[PDB]
Symmetry: D2
Subunit: 295 residues, 4 copies
């Protein structure tokens, strides 16, 4: 037998950083969860019990805190590239670093219409994420994403004209609820190294904001023919607005809300045009994915 | 042996209701999770296998949907009182109904600065809850609450002057992070029945909004001497603003963020006045509770 | 305003202890999660910012580890009583301690039919719990429990003869699946103090084992007329076997498995006597409770 | 823009099936959670709102229940291959089916030393899983796995001789706790179609059992030099015992238990050879992966 692939590192490293403006007294906080996995010439730790090749996962954890102390942590695409580059440059035998970052929301509170200098609220479990793969001699590959964005529209969603055969019971509809949790990922063109990533720094926050805005607007305004058709419209617009993105992927659950027929009880009308009370279904759920690129 | 207490019913009943304004085309959604447990003369179902006394939990579920179809579901204090009253009035042998409601957030989206007529976003897992106990001949007891409100302040929290003995290692501090998940409950004076609850309907939403506002403002503005001292200030203000509340209870975790000493690495300074990077701790956590009433 | 009630302390304190037999080389591990909340003359920490009355929650955490170092941690009823007594005896102004312990399973592995001296497996998320309330001048109140015991029987459960009215759609049945997660609590007679708790030490493990055995046997053997009727039989037997128990409480979800009518597809028969494939329902669920005591 | 990849289907489909032996009266239950995602000529549903190409996800759900009614559901490798083959054979324009199955444990109860005919217990959240990819003209690729197997050993684990530099604080050790949650996957050689899968049916359960046995024995008996070294020994043995497996992958968290220095309190000794009480750490955790194949 032989080692075909191996990677190891530290997962679930929680980090908080605060920035204090001495002039204004305004403080800004960042909180993330980080995972770093390394690859390289490490097979002998598996096959020969040779620990000399192992950068201890405890040391990886230390390195994350040290790097956060000495560098900006925003945008996360920059921080992840700095962190990944460190490992491949510092250790001769490590040839790839894989960095995943989840950014948690701490939104500045408004108290009496004014932004508070040092108090924050977690407004939703929506996350902004990055996956950064730093590979020695092959540059830096970055995938950025938003996830946990949960939305619902109460009308202007349809689903009719699908295949009907002996396995089909679903009725065609011209008016239904549509609800999903959005997971959207945009993949950047490959970067040659940290200098190139630094030159594009302003594009990271702007593209995140655009992806979010396009997602919300298209969801709210599209008279949706299916999840498939609506998500394609979102991905098309994002690609049109940022030339440095190569692909956009969406992964969308279809979270079903079922009509409840109440006619058995005193002829009460609660279906079709009379539907007011619905039963949200915890499971099963549709799951629809698509990756859109440039033609 | 003998039955000392018994209650039974349906838990985890998810309900969605939509309201459609025909004039404006504006739609508003409500989504809740409901639990109803009944008590009364039901001992024989336990001791004698006498099912004749059991209102099936499946029937309780039906009743929830029917009641939501025929009545407003907001404010939840009103809906819960209607639902509880139904069971004690309809069934001679049922003498108490216990209704718990969790309200989930569906906040209307703003698209291009305008409120959208039928699209919504889940902005945070914060909940608004009610517990309604309807007891035949003893009226209606309502506890209202907010929970899952997660906040953090990066300075203006202190903790010094606590008891020090041979079990104490904690250092006194004049500047720390304070972060918690707020659970706050206000208990209404007892109501004689549904007519009285209906007469106070406008106070329910207003008091929820006040409790929330007071919580956020006090948290952000108090130069906090301890969780204990700050939470007391919150409860005191809520009681001052709503005479129909008898008690306010807060239950607050103290979610610790620890300094990381980096001086072992090239004398890097990251403690006290130089602290920028911190380690959020998942566990253990302080837990501080208090119930404040009128003197 | 005035403080009507207050308690504070440390929650989610994870503790592991190992015992090593020097003779046999056999090691035994215990792992728990502990919460300690204190009450007493502490109102001024809330009303006056007087921290002098506060035993820091960090110190409570230290005390848990120290107590675990110097005392047995099994049975958990004994450990919790030791821990609670410590706080009310050590601090003049603290008059009650409330200790909750969750014990996690680490079951010794069998390798080639022999018990391994130092390797363990987590066989199920079933827990053994205690709640110990130590109140100065009123002794020690202990509630012991098992929870997270998930069982299912595929036949020999019935449910017929329940109340039928205009809210009822549920069909009577003489053969259904019954599945639940068992939460069972037995409350001990009040103990005068630690000496009395120590005198009953052998009864704690034996009663836990009896409660578990009775639960499983009765579930498997009862031709069940309802959850209500079966759970009563369990509680009755436990009370008969241990005179020092005052009450037994069960809290049982009814986790529904629904028939799926497939007759729309080529007349396929999958209901009643022909039912083979079922749809487990995540929600809603019945919830049935009862507290049984001595007559 | 263009669709580069697309797949869609139904996730979280819970299924229960019971088998009844008429002779013995013995019943056996199976419970699974299933996900089916389809690929093929479906781009136009995304780009042109052409629903005619969509097999509704609701119909996929129906098909799962129908297939479970008409076929054995065990071993899951066989069931998944049947289900995947159905979709690519039934629909001309669907060319790949991806089936994921999670099998939940329902272990027959022993009551008074005898196996009960129809009562079951969930002994642990350990799962047996399959991923089946059925691709038209390319056969059937099956990955089998076990996951959620949580183990701990209290001694006979070491970790010394790792790289030490200016980022390293971790002390070398010759005696530590080792605890992990095992995720192990074995990938079968490609099968030409359903006939070939059926010819190997007895190997599926036997190989699962071998993978489990090897994992537990090696964990318990290896005087472990690192997670890396121990996991390699496991994978090597599995490959030696089943020639039809091409690769074995393990993914293992290192769940840390930290010593607690208590010497600040009355010189209490709780480190090194005197360590008895430890603090389990919820996060961060090491994460170690390896894929082993044949040389
Ligand atoms: O938008 C939808 N897309 C689908 O593929 C589907 N299948 N059922 N309902 C559905 N809705
Ligand atoms: O605000 C606090 N209250 C407390 O009781 C405490 N104990 N440790 N840190 C603390 N902080
Ligand atoms: O055992 C049961 N008890 C109940 O109270 C009930 N209500 N519906 N089904 C039920 N089953
Ligand atoms: O077994 C281990 N492997 C590792 O790579 C490691 N790093 N720190 N501790 C460790 N333990
Ligand atoms: Na390198
Ligand atoms: Na009544
Ligand atoms: Na005392
Ligand atoms: Na096909
Ligand atoms: Xe951070
Ligand atoms: Xe969508
Ligand atoms: Xe609702
Ligand atoms: Xe607070
Ligand atoms: Xe312990
Ligand atoms: Xe039961
Ligand atoms: Xe199944
Ligand atoms: Xe391991």
């Amino acid at each position: 037998s032989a080692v075909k692939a191996a990677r190891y590192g530290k997962d679930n490293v929680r980090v908080y950083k605060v920035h204090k403006d001495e002039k204004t007294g305004v403080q800004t906080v960042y909180e993330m969860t980080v995972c770093v996995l390394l690859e390289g010439e490490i097979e002998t730790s598996y096959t020969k019990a040779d620990n000399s090749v192992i950068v201890a996962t405890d040391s990886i954890k230390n390195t994350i805190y040290i790097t956060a102390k000495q560098n900006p942590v925003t945008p996360p695409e920059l921080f992840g590239s700095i962190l990944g580059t460190h490992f491949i440059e510092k250790y001769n035998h490590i040839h790839a670093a894989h960095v995943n970052i989840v950014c948690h929301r701490w939104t500045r509170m408004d108290i009496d219409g004014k932004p508070h200098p040092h108090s924050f609220i977690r407004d939703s479990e929506e996350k902004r994420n990055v996956q950064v793969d730093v590979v020695e001699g092959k540059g830096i590959d970055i995938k950025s994403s938003l996830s946990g964005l949960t939305v619902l529209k109460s009308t202007n969603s349809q689903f009719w004209g699908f295949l009907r055969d002996e396995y089909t019971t679903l009725k065609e509809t011209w008016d239904r609820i549509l609800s999903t949790d959005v997971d959207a990922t945009w993949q950047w063109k490959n970067f040659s190294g940290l200098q190139e990533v630094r030159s594009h720094v302003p594009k990271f926050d702007a593209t995140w904001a655009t992806a979010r805005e396009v997602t919300l607007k298209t969801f709210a305004e599209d008279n949706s023919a299916s999840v498939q058709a609506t998500m394609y419209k979102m991905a098309e617009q994002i690609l049109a607005r940022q030339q440095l993105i190569e692909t956009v992927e969406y992964s969308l659950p279809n979270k079903h809300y079922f009509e409840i027929d109440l006619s058995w009880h005193k002829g009460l009308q609660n279906t079709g045009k009379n539907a007011e009370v619905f039963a949200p279904q915890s499971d099963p759920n549709g799951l629809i994915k698509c990756t859109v690129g440039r033609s």
